[PDB]
A paper describes a structure:
Serpins play important roles in multiple processes, such as blood coagulation, fibrinolysis, tumor metastasis and immunity. Mature serpins usually contain 350–400 amino acids and share a conserved folding pattern that is mainly composed of eight or nine α-helices, three β-sheets, and a reactive center loop (RCL). The exposed RCL is located near the carboxyl-terminus, and it acts as bait for protease binding and cleavage. Three homologous serpins have been identified in the silk gland (a highly specialized organ that functions to synthesize and store silk proteins) of Bombyx mori: serpin16, serpin18, and serpin22.
To understand the physiological roles and inhibitory mechanism of these serpins, we determined the crystal structure of serpin18 at 1.65 Å. The overall fold of serpin18 resembles the canonical serpin conformation: an α/β fold consisting of one core β-sheets surrounded by nine α-helices (hA–hI) that are classified according to the conventional serpin nomenclature. Specifically, the segment with residues Glu352–Pro368 makes up the active RCL region, which is folded into a 1.5-turn helix (Glu355–Ser360) and two defined loops (Gln352–Thr354 and Gln361–Pro365, respectively). All residues of the RCL were well defined in the final electron density map, presumably because of the interaction between the RCL region and the underlying protein scaffold. The RCL in serpin18 is situated directly above of β-sheet C, and is closer to the core of the protein compared to those of the classical serpins. Further structural analysis showed that the RCL in serpin18 adopts a more stable conformation, presumably because of interactions between the RCL center region and β-sheet C. Furthermore, multiple-sequence alignment and structural analyses showed that the RCL in serpin18 is shorter by about 7 amino acids compared to that of the typical serpins. Notably, the length of the RCL up to the scissile bond in serpin18 is only 11 amino acids, whereas the length in other serpins is always 17 residues (P17–P1)23. Moreover, the papain-like mammalian cysteine protease, cathepsin L, was also inactivated by serpin18. These results demonstrated that serpin18 might act as a cysteine protease inhibitor, instead of as a serine protease inhibitor. In contrast, the inhibitory activities of the V362G and V362T mutants dramatically decreased, resulting in an extrapolated molar ratio of inhibitor-to-protease, which increased from ~1.3 for the wild-type to ~5–7 for the Val362 variants. This result confirmed the importance of Val362 at the reactive site of serpin18. Thus, we conclude that serpin18 plays a physiological role in regulating the activity of fibroinase and protecting silk proteins from degradation during B. mori development.
Residue numbers in the entry: 15 to 392
């Protein structure tokens, strides 16, 4: 069991797909800071890519082309083979880290999916379809499934009333990832929680608990992006990046806009230089998120026709009609290993840097693409 599965025939395309993932994470945080500066939040883009990939196997020509442009993939062979590899990775558990990413497609009991869709969803993703009554307790059916299957009880993005007989295709994903810390003598780890003073984006002053953490890492002040960045490994292959503004004014928008370009993260990862890190970070080691991607995809100006009731661009999702996409749910639990009382006693909590204002994080795998991106503003 490992997380380096790659298609050997479409290798370049898999690397390009990771660049699409990296860039979507950038669009995501750029939009969060613009539209939702009051929110602390995090997310993963892999389930969105998987959903769009699935749709790209079942679309008419123009829609297929638009889907391909967003995926950085350009053929059925690429979509199938890249996604089979990445799906395997994101469903592997081993001693290095554990990942689960499971997909469902919902439709009303009287509108069954095409056998073509059911087959390709199973083939590429081990996706499963569910036929439910859109007139009776459909929100609860979905909520209960996501929460039960994932073990994650956070509330879902739907509210009762959101689903009726005119509702179209509903796609869902749940992602559960667990990361242990490195096991080297100087692996960066959290040790103990300490009080810090925090100043929120809107100026609110408060006290927070923060994990005093230390170990080998990397650091840079990156003037052109207006940020300082701290970087450390988990188990080998995995990297966390923490960033925060150079200025007290939290001028983060230029950094987030640049993160829309996948080159920016590759640049960041080389600008940093080795530094022993002693930090205090106000973050929870278990984080949960549940969202509907569609509002964010619409904010980005992408694929807007797919979400209209009159859409006619799908070919083989249904035998009798196009169908349209109503909700794209992503239900996420991110967990980091908890430190022990014995570990706490081994260090003196004297941080060189405290994250005492808005900051962001990315967690990367061995392909240097983010499994998750998060933003803390308050
Ligand atoms: Na470097």
């Amino acid at each position: 069991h490992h997380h380096h599965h790659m298609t050997k025939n479409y290798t370049e395309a898999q690397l390009k797909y990771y660049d699409a993932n990296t860039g979507l994470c950038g669009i995501g945080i750029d939009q969060w800071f613009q539209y939702e500066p009051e929110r602390n939040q995090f997310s993963t883009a892999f389930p969105l890519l998987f959903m769009l990939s699935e749709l790209s196997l079942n679309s008419k020509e123009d829609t297929t082309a638009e889907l391909y442009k967003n995926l950085n993939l350009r053929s059925e062979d690429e979509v199938v083979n890249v996604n089979q590899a990445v799906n395997t990775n994101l469903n592997t558990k081993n001693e290095v880290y554990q990942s689960t990413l499971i997909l469902n497609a919902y439709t009303d009991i009287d509108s069954p999916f095409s056998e073509t869709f059911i087959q390709n969803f199973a083939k590429v993703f081990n996706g499963t379809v569910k036929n439910i009554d859109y007139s009776n307790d459909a929100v609860a059916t979905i909520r209960d499934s996501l929460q039960s299957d994932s073990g994650n009880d956070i509330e879902i993005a739907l509210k009762d009333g959101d689903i009726n007989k005119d509702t179209g295709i509903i796609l869902t994903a749940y992602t559960n990832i667990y990361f242990p810390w490195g096991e080297a003598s100087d692996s960066y780890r959290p040790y103990k929680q300490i009080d810090i003073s925090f100043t929120a984006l809107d100026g609110t002053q408060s006290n927070k608990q923060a994990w005093y953490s230390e170990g080998a890492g990397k650091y840079a002040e990156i003037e052109n992006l207006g940020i300082k960045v701290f970087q450390f490994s988990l188990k080998p292959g995995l990297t966390v990046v923490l960033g925060t503004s150079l200025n007290d004014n939290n001028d983060l928008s230029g950094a987030f806009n640049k993160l829309r370009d996948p080159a920016t993260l590759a640049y960041i990862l080389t600008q940093t230089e080795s530094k022993y890190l002693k930090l205090a970070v106000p973050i929870e080691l278990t984080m949960r998120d549940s969202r509907d991607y569609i509002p964010e995809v619409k904010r980005a100006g992408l694929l807007t026709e797919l979400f209209e009731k009159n859409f006619d661009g799908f070919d083989t999702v249904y035998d009798n009609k196009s169908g349209y996409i109503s909700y794209m749910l992503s239900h996420t639990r991110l967990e980091f290993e908890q430190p022990t009382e014995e570990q706490a006693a081994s260090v003196v909590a004297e941080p060189d840097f405290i994250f005492d204002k808005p900051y962001f994080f990315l967690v990367l795998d061995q392909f240097n693409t983010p499994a998750f991106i998060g933003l803390i503003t308050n």
